[PDB]
UniProtKB/Swiss-Prot annotation, chain A:
The chain holds residues 5 to 55 of 164 of the full protein. It comes from Chloroflexus aurantiacus (strain ATCC 29366 / DSM 635 / J-10-fl). Belongs to the ATPase B chain family. It is found in: Cell membrane. F(1)F(0) ATP synthase produces ATP from ADP in the presence of a proton or sodium gradient. F-type ATPases consist of two structural domains, F(1) containing the extramembraneous catalytic core and F(0) containing the membrane proton channel, linked together by a central stalk and a peripheral stalk. During catalysis, ATP synthesis in the catalytic domain of F(1) is coupled via a rotary mechanism of the central stalk subunits to proton translocation. Component of the F(0) channel, it forms part of the peripheral stalk, linking F(1) to F(0). F-type ATPases have 2 components, F(1) - the catalytic core - and F(0) - the membrane proton channel. F(1) has five subunits: alpha(3), beta(3), gamma(1), delta(1), epsilon(1). F(0) has four main subunits: a(1), b(2) and c(10-14). The alpha and beta chains form an alternating ring which encloses part of the gamma chain. F(1) is attached to F(0) by a central stalk formed by the gamma and epsilon chains, while a peripheral stalk is formed by the delta and b chains. This is ATP synthase subunit b.
Length: 51, 55
């Protein structure tokens, strides 16, 4: 398969899938940040309560 | 959640410790009153013995 039109279409589809994956990965970063913040807050609260 | 509830739990624990301290203070006061009454009785007995010796 050697066709410039096919290559252009494949590149366009790859770019669209890249945007979709960008949104999907942007969600996981927020999820991980929320988890880390929750863990830090829990540790701080436990220390304060013990003191 | 344990820390959030444990703020009030520690407040209640301080209140319970204060109640236990009040109970211990009451027991100590009762013991001290008994000791003071015993000392007063001993002083009265010594006074009676001294009066008898003087007679």
């Amino acid at each position: 398969g050697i066709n410039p039109t096919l290559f252009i279409a494949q590149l366009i589809n790859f770019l669209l899938l890249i945007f979709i994956l960008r949104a999907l990965l942007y969600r996981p970063v927020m999820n991980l940040l929320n988890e880390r913040t929750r863990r830090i807050e829990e540790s701080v609260r436990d220390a304060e309560k013990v003191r | 959640e344990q820390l959030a509830n444990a703020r009030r739990d520690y407040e209640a624990e301080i209140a319970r410790a204060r109640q236990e301290a009040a109970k211990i203070v009451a027991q100590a006061q009762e013991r001290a009153k008994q000791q003071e009454a015993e000392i007063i009785a001993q002083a009265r007995r010594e006074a009676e013995r001294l009066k008898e010796e003087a007679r």
